[PDB]
Design a binder for this molecule. Structure first.
Ligand SMILES: CCN1C(=O)[C@H](c2cc(O)cc(-c3cccnc3)c2)C(=O)N(c2ccccc2)c2cc(C(F)(F)F)ccc21
Ligand SMILES: O=C(O)c1ccc(-c2ccc3c(c2)nc(-c2cn[nH]c2-c2cccc(Cl)c2)n3CCCn2ccnc2)cc1
Length: 131
């Protein structure tokens, strides 16, 4: 996350989270916990976390599809320092430096916060699917 500059979530925190998500798989109480954990997150942070958490293969694919759908919608709503496109917000086509750039620009585009809402949309769809 960006702190008072960028620093990775600590390994101890991420590894503990992996176990929490496993124990609480597919339950909605994970969602607010995700929001708390990812305070200040860049898209790079978020992808490291998602990749570390891993989990259920079909669920991961559904999350990915949801993200891609939201990135497409972002491009429709906000066609394009350069401005980020959907894939930049998802951290696919952007660097960590670029993400920090947008997040701290005057005025800013909070690419981490935007990506978080896409991830949360996916997590909610997953909750319903496995309920
Ligand atoms: C989408 C992929 N994914 C999993 O497959 C998780 C998972 C992890 C795991 O270690 C085991 C399972 C699992 C599920 C069912 C059977 N056996 C194992 C699922 C899991 O259950 N959820 C999940 C939890 C609650 C609600 C919705 C989804 C999350 C959560 C996140 C995060 F961090 F962003 F919140 C990231 C990936 C992720
Ligand atoms: O959902 C959300 O949370 C959400 C949704 C949208 C936005 C958003 C989107 C585009 C935005 C924006 C804010 N602020 C500006 C904006 C306004 N002036 N300069 C910029 C800007 C230019 C380049 C890089 C960055 Cl970093 C900012 N633009 C660029 C608009 C086009 N423009 C205006 C001036 N130059 C280019 C922020 C948050």
């Amino acid at each position: 996350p960006i702190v008072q500059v960028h620093q990775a979530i600590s390994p101890r925190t991420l590894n503990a989270w992996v176990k929490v998500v496993e124990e609480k798989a597919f339950s909605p109480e994970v969602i607010p916990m995700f929001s708390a954990l990812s305070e200040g997150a860049t898209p790079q942070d978020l992808n490291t976390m998602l990749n570390t958490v891993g989990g259920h293969q079909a669920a991961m694919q559904m999350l990915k599809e949801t993200i891609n759908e939201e990135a497409a919608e972002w491009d429709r709503l906000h066609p394009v320092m350069r401005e980020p496109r959907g894939s930049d917000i998802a951290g696919t086509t952007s660097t960590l430096q670029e993400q920090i750039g947008w997040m701290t620009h005057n005025p800013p585009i909070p690419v981490g916060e935007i990506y978080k809402r896409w991830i949360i949309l996916g997590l909610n769809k997953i909750v319903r699917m496995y309920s």
